[PDB]
Design a protein around this ligand. Sequence first.
Ligand SMILES: *[C@@H]1O[C@H](CO)[C@@H](O[C@@H]2O[C@H](CO)[C@@H](O)[C@H](O)[C@H]2NC(C)=O)[C@H](O)[C@H]1NC(C)=O
Ligand SMILES: *[C@@H]1O[C@H](CO)[C@@H](O[C@@H]2O[C@H](CO)[C@@H](O)[C@H](O)[C@H]2NC(C)=O)[C@H](O)[C@H]1NC(C)=O
Ligand SMILES: *[C@@H]1O[C@H](CO)[C@@H](O)[C@H](O)[C@H]1NC(C)=O
Ligand SMILES: *[C@@H]1O[C@H](CO)[C@@H](O)[C@H](O)[C@H]1NC(C)=O
Ligand SMILES: *[C@@H]1O[C@H](CO)[C@@H](O)[C@H](O)[C@H]1NC(C)=O
Lengths: 66, 412, 98, 49, 49
Amino acid sequence: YQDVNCTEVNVFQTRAGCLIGAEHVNNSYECDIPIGAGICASYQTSQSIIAYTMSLGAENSVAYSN
Amino acid sequence: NSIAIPTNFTISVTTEILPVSMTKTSVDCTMYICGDSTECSNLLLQYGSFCTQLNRALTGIAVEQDKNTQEVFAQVKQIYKTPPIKDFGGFNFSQILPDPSKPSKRSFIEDLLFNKVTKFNGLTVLPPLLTDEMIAQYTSALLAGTITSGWTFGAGAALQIPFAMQMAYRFNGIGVTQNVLYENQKLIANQFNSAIGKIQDSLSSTASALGKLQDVVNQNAQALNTLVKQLSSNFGAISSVLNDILSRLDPPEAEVQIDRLITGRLQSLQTYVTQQLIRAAEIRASANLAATKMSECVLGQSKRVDFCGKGYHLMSFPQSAPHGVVFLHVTYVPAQEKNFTTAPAICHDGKAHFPREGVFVSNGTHWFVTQRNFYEPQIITTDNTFVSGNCDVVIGIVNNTVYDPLQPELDS
Amino acid sequence: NGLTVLPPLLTDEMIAQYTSALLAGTITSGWTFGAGAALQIPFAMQMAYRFNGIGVTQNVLYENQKLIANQFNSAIGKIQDSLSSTASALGKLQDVVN
Amino acid sequence: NSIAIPTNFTISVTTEILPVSMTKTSVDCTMYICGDSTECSNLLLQYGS
Amino acid sequence: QSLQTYVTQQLIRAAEIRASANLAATKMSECVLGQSKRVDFCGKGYHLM
Ligand SMILES: *[C@@H]1O[C@H](CO)[C@@H](O[C@@H]2O[C@H](CO)[C@@H](O)[C@H](O)[C@H]2NC(C)=O)[C@H](O)[C@H]1NC(C)=O
Ligand SMILES: *[C@@H]1O[C@H](CO)[C@@H](O[C@@H]2O[C@H](CO)[C@@H](O)[C@H](O)[C@H]2NC(C)=O)[C@H](O)[C@H]1NC(C)=O
Ligand SMILES: *[C@@H]1O[C@H](CO)[C@@H](O)[C@H](O)[C@H]1NC(C)=O
Ligand SMILES: *[C@@H]1O[C@H](CO)[C@@H](O)[C@H](O)[C@H]1NC(C)=O
Ligand SMILES: *[C@@H]1O[C@H](CO)[C@@H](O)[C@H](O)[C@H]1NC(C)=O
């Protein structure tokens, strides 16, 4: 529900609106079906729709030295 | 017979500011054309798909703003991070790298850029898919890659190289002999650091520097204000307020007055959507230009003249801005011009000689060979020059002497 | 009917001055005026750099300088003959006007 | 095992033509629609912006 | 309606001209002010000037 609070409408409040039916998952993944405001959703595990903050890629420091 | 060779340089950081996206507006046209009115809605259905192709056109614009923003920023397969120690040979990126003290971890110069830029009628504003905190992880990844690994993170995985060896590589890219860096490394580090200092003075003092991004935000706000104001027009109807028509006239007459309002509001929405489709092409061509500058200037070094601001391009650092990007393009500019007599070729033992690299020049009594971009005279030898043909062919050749490094080794 | 045409800010004379400046720069200082100061260079040497830039050793230019200058001069004369006789040559600009 | 290497060259000059600008027209929307007419202009105002 | 049609066509046409102007500006910088390594960017053949 775009641009509404989870009041008037397994409920996840995002800045894109009130998302109902998607499980909020702490693990990030590559973006699949974009929702907005950093949140994407996908169908995964038994399977269900999940919502998560998308990953921007793996973290990799460079072994920089003089 | 005269060539000017500059005996010194200045390193100039020029800001280039580019729109990259615009506000993802979307309008429930069936609410804008007919608000909470069943009688009006049933009449609007007689126009078929004139609504759903406008819901569709605006959705196409809204979806591609994240395409633009992804293509410009997400040019990196990994989120690279800077080392704990800042051992960059004297260069000082602390004003363009993240500030861990902030809630959204923008750089110092990204905070200046985020400071200088400033409904009920079916209108909405959809959020971007990349939050301005995720854009700042991508520009920090592009930038921590650029600093620690040069172009190599664009070709493969990031290969570390010391920053004094990365700039020595970029000086060879502009044809300046890389020892011109090491022999001047503190001067070059200090001119980079001082030139980054001027960026803060510019962006802090002069709000008009952001003129392109504020223009894009103003055009989108002016179009929405025009669209909302156009609800107040009668278009030939007895009233612009739909409820006042319905509360006063029976259907056989109310429908006529309503059709007048429907025609006017529908044409007035098509005008907005057509303007936004043309304005979205104007931003999409700017996102593709920003994506191209990201790929060629940041992930690389550009041989294209004036592509990365005035000067010979050395490197660029991306910073984010509200609905845009900013490139801090670092360029070598040759500065202290000097005058010399010059020769196309030199004559020695009947042979003509030409410089493998550099220009034959004369301060007025002696002849030297030297790189074109930085006065650095060399005694002329068989190692700086090659023989081809003889004296009787070149126009404007000069009868100097060319030294042989082997002779004294066999003479002694 | 209310239909008018506004003049351009830069008049044809001003455009001519800019192309003149760009041309004079190109001829007397090569590319240096683009990067920074216009640094005078003997034209033949400028061409030598232009040749190295395409993978042809500079001695080729000097040894063939008379040939190259003659081919260049002839090529320009051909440009004039084409533009003076082929109306369609400027079709891209005429089409905008139309 | 065969390579063709040019032994001579020619300098050619070609002409590339590009549009830069278009005529800066300007239309007075009121005069166009309701030229010198008060009665028409007042009706035109009902169309707002 | 006639004006709206005209203006829309001018905006679209203006975008085409703008793209051409941008190309022309790019060439000026990367063709006149410099030397192009970009193939057929500045005519067929190896660009000199
Ligand atoms: C042009 O440069 C040469 C080399 O630097 C100058 O000749 C030398 O000048 C110095 C200082 O007077 C003497 O110590 C050397 O013995 C000279 N010979 C060499 C090394 O070439 C020359 O004087 C300069 N041009 C001028 C101003 O006449
Ligand atoms: C390269 O080609 C040019 C022609 O494009 C040759 O120059 C011509 O030589 C003939 C004699 O064989 C003369 O009659 C022409 O008038 C010359 N033309 C010009 C423009 O000079 C040139 O000799 C050739 N070079 C080589 C090495 O074969
Ligand atoms: C929803 O309402 C609560 C108050 O009950 C408020 O604290 C919260 O911030 C609101 N969320 C949104 C997205 O408006
Ligand atoms: C994420 O982990 C925290 C514990 O660190 C937990 O409290 C929170 O409920 C988890 N959220 C989700 C969506 O699993
Ligand atoms: C080169 O000579 C010209 C002569 O007109 C003079 O104006 C110019 O300043 C001289 N350049 C330098 C670097 O001395």
